[PDB]
Ligand binder design. Structure first.
Ligand SMILES: Cc1cc(Nc2nc(/C=C/c3ccccc3)nc3cc(N4CCN(C)CC4)ccc23)n[nH]1
Length: 258
């Protein structure tokens, strides 16, 4: 059981809607950590109150070297706070902004780790759904780490921008564990190209592109990368491979890092 007067707040790390997240230190232990505070005001004013309590509990016991740890939570009058693992090399989103694109060795590595992190998430019937670069942080070794289980869900269910969502969920419909493999294909595409495969500039253009799986590869995406991506980006879920198989796909193996 915790309170705010047990940590001292460092610099702000980033501000989204709901609340900000700061670097922080546990006053007793001198432990370095992240402190995402979420505003109980905007929580009642967005109805995600049941989604967060779900977010907390689910990650509150997922433990994996490529999943950000949630150590605990607490609330006061105006707000609630999550006390999170601190990942010292920032977001995958920002290193993509600064590099424009990644090379094969680098993306193959990210996909590997994310596959493993996902494979584990699956082994406890947890589907993430929202796997964009903005939820991927990097730890001390530049290893990828799945943050923000804001919209994760336990078991198959029927529950922003759609660039990362699969055809299943977009057109209503029921979805399973295979949604994250769509996401993984979308991610591997954005890692290599600099934009997700279905970027457009109005929501329904993008909806149509996803709906009919419409994407092209620029010339510099290799024979091996094109295969993998086309493999995961399948309208039909069950036609998408298993995380075991993608981990073993020769372009990943030839280019990943052990
Ligand atoms: C929860 C958590 C965050 C976190 N680490 C970091 N988060 C955010 C920014 C996060 C963010 C949050 C909301 C909105 C926008 C950004 N920015 C960061 C920037 C960092 N640096 C130092 C390393 N540099 C390469 C980039 C600037 C390092 C860690 C960061 N560890 N654990």
């Amino acid at each position: 059981q915790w309170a705010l007067e047990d940590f001292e707040i460092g610099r702000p790390l980033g501000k989204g809607k709901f609340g900000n997240v700061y670097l922080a230190r546990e006053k007793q232990s001198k432990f370095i950590l992240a402190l995402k505070v979420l505003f109980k005001a905007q929580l009642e004013k967005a109805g995600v109150e049941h989604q967060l309590r779900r977010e907390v509990e689910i990650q509150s016991h997922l433990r994996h070297p490529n999943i950000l740890r949630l150590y605990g939570y607490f609330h006061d009058a105006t707000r609630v706070y999550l006390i999170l693992e601190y990942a010292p090399l920032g977001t995958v989103y920002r290193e993509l902004q600064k590099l424009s694109k990644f090379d094969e060795q680098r993306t193959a590595t990210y996909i590997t780790e994310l596959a493993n992190a996902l494979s584990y998430c699956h082994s406890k019937r947890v589907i993430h759904r929202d796997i964009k670069p903005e939820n991927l942080l990097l730890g001390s070794a530049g290893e990828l780490k799945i943050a923000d289980f804001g919209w994760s869900v336990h078991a198959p269910s029927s529950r922003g921008t759609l660039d990362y969502l699969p055809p299943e969920m977009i057109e209503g419909r029921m979805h399973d564990e295979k949604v994250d493999l769509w996401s993984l294909g979308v991610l591997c595409y954005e890692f290599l190209v600099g934009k997700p495969p279905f970027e457009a500039n109005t929501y329904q253009e993008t909806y149509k592109r996803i709906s009919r799986v419409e994407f092209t590869f620029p010339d510099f995406v290799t024979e091996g990368a094109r295969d993998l991506i086309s493999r995961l980006l399948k309208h039909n879920p069950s036609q998408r491979p298993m995380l075991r198989e993608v981990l073993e796909h020769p372009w990943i193996t030839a280019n990943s890092s052990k």
